[PDB]
Design a protein around this ligand. Structure first.
Ligand SMILES: *[C@@H]1O[C@H](CO)[C@@H](O)[C@H](O)[C@H]1NC(C)=O
Lengths: 40, 50
């Protein structure tokens, strides 16, 4: 992480009101089997 | 037309097309169902989209 200060402004507020207790990350693959770029 | 309440927030109230705007006659102060006192005519500050 770079050494600096950046305040994260809000973008959109979602009035869903649901019950969620988990998360999962989706990644994208590059076809040229499959190749994946450098990400973190 | 059937209505019910659930866990989702209620965002159907809307503006209800109750148009009214005046700042010169000094009659009454009310906003968003919240009354009080005050006069609002001009400003120089810049707000944010949120
Ligand atoms: C959301 O789920 C948790 C457990 O899954 C439960 O304890 C909680 O009451 C739920 N929220 C509401 C508003 O019912």
């Amino acid at each position: 992480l770079p050494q600096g200060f950046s305040a994260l402004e809000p973008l959109v507020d979602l009035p869903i009101g649901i019950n969620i207790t988990r998360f999962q990350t989706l990644l994208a693959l590059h076809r040229s089997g499959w190749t994946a770029g450098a990400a973190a | 037309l059937s209505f019910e309440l659930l866990h989702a927030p209620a965002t159907v109230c809307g503006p209800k097309k109750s148009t009214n705007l005046v700042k010169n006659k000094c009659v009454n102060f009310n906003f968003n169902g919240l009354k009080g006192t005050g006069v609002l005519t001009e400003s120089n500050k810049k707000f944010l989209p949120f």
